[PDB]
Amino acid sequence: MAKWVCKICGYIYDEDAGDPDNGISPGTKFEELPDDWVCPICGAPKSEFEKL
Numbered sequence: 001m002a003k004w005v006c007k008i009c010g011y012i013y014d015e016d017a018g019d020p021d022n023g024i025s026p027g028t029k030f031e032e033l034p035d036d037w038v039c040p041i042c043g044a045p046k047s048e049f050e051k052l
């Protein structure tokens with residue numbers, strides 16, 4: 001699956017990994033993330049991510 005980078009801090013959202021600690025199971029596509037999900041490292045909104 002796809003990876004997306006936070007343009008602010010360099011965190012990579014990997015759809016295969018999800019973000020379980022913040023309520024996101026593995027295999028969740030970036031577009032399926034809740035509108036109020038943010039970068040777990042720097043707090044940036046989804047708008048600041050770019051698909052790799």
Ligand SMILES: [Fe+3]
Pocket residue numbers: 006007008009010011039040041042043044
């Ligand atoms: Fe970030």
